[PDB]
Design a protein around this ligand. Structure first.
Ligand SMILES: O=C(c1ccc(Nc2nccc(-c3cc4ccccc4s3)n2)cc1)N1CCC(N2CCCC2)CC1
Ligand SMILES: O=C(c1ccc(Nc2nccc(-c3cc4ccccc4s3)n2)cc1)N1CCC(N2CCCC2)CC1
Lengths: 242, 244
């Protein structure tokens, strides 16, 4: 609900997402930033300094609305790259590149006792995808995207890094095929499959990818104890077969 | 200046370097930033190039402003060491070859990236080369701040600059990192300046015999005429690597 508008000195350029997120020209510096705005306290994002995690510049309050100024990743999210190219799935080597980059960001955040809690294709941005300056970034540190949420997180149990691993594996499944491991119009059904349904064989969707079956079986395990120890271990197990 | 003082909401913690640069607690976010402050040209200080640059080896600028007539730049604080402190306290006679190729390659990339976008650093030196978590897997080489020891002759003369000026500085920096001292060392800055302008670039082999093979590399990168240097900073970084 703002275009060509001025907000805390920022000039609104485009809507980027929804907590509504605008592409905005900075009041003092000649560059474009991502401005997240509230209508009616994630300091952790400022705590993180990683080449694959979107940086926060500043936070504030303008006319009762809380705002976060952060880096703008000038490219696409993996959702759009999936729908406009690769509707049936991304090439294996490009997925290992993206998942490794995000695995590192998450492992870094985990070592500092911070969980992302919402890893999904829409939070994986790639600046200049077809350029040498190509850069993979992780952003955004009731029925939301239950498509990638780990069962223990849905149940509201005590979390660790292996919750984000599940989400990353669910994300990777989506990127390689053209759909998440559990697809249904009814969120309640998706939630129930996360909790109770055996994780599906990726080979049953894309025959060429059968070798990865035990990899997704492991990373999408119901019990966190049965997954990989770190996200890069999962990313490496992908690489080994792609 | 005063440690524990408030400047534009930032709490000053210590001076990091010198444009004096302080480690400062951010007014609103719970983290430490590098705050660069000016005393008394304003247009020049508004080289808004640094905000234009977004590279994994270039220190990020968050914001710029004016507090009681003093211009300030809020930028990332690289929690680790500069290469100066690494030389003084760990490797007084020079750093290991492989570690220097790592650092110079990382900085060469940052500079080559900035050059392709028509932007020059203009002050490459050991104190602007930071390494966060040096001894950790999270190790990260950063070039910050986008003394005549490293300045190229054309830059000292105030002539038209190109990327090859920063190359000279990077090569002079690499010489220092490898040997313990810059290519031209003298208490009198005027003498250092004169050697930059007129003196044949020294043989790195004449300081550290093991490094004789790099002689033509530094001869080339420290050339008087920019046209006689490498085309890109990574070409210089690669020529180092080949012989280390
Ligand atoms: O591919 C992208 C895209 C490009 C760059 C960024 N960058 C960028 N940088 C930094 C941070 C963020 C974000 C952070 C954040 C947090 C919560 C929700 C969304 C977001 S987006 N994004 C984000 C997307 N788009 C096409 C589809 C999209 N949609 C929604 C409107 C019409 C269709 C609009 C934009
Ligand atoms: O090893 C360091 C060091 C650590 C972190 C940073 N970080 C950091 N981050 C972000 C930006 C910057 C800089 C910006 C900038 C701009 C101009 C000149 C130098 C710099 S350094 N630095 C810079 C140094 N120090 C050792 C002692 C040194 N003493 C002795 C001699 C003088 C004072 C200063 C501190």
């Amino acid at each position: 609900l703002a275009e060509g508008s001025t907000f805390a000195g920022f000039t609104i350029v485009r809507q980027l997402g929804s907590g509504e997120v605008y592409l905005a020209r900075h009041p003092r510096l000649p560059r474009q930033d991502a401005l997240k705005v509230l209508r009616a306290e994630a300091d952790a994002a400022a705590s993180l300094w990683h080449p694959h995690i979107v940086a926060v510049h500043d936070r504030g309050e303008f006319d009762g609305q809380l705002w976060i100024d952060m880096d703008f990743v000038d490219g696409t999210d993996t959702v759009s790259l999936l729908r406009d190219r690769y509707p049936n799935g991304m090439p294996g080597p490009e997925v290992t590149e993206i998942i490794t980059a995000v695995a590192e960001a998450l492992d870094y955040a985990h070592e500092r006792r911070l969980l992302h809690r919402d890893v999904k294709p829409a939070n994986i941005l790639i600046a200049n995808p077809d350029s040498p300056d190509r850069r993979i970034m992780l952003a955004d540190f009731t029925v939301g995207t239950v498509s990638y949420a780990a069962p223990e997180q849905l149940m509201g149990n005590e979390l660790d890094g292996r919750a984000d691993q599940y989400a990353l594996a669910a994300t990777a499944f989506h990127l390689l095929t053209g759909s998440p491991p559990f697809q249904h119009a009814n969120p309640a059904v998706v939630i129930s499959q996360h909790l109770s349904a055996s994780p599906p064989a990726i080979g049953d969707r894309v025959p060429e990818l059968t070798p990865l079956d035990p990899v997704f079986a492991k990373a999408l395990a119901k019990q966190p104890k049965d997954r990989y120890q770190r996200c890069v271990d999962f990313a490496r197990a992908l690489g080994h077969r792609l």
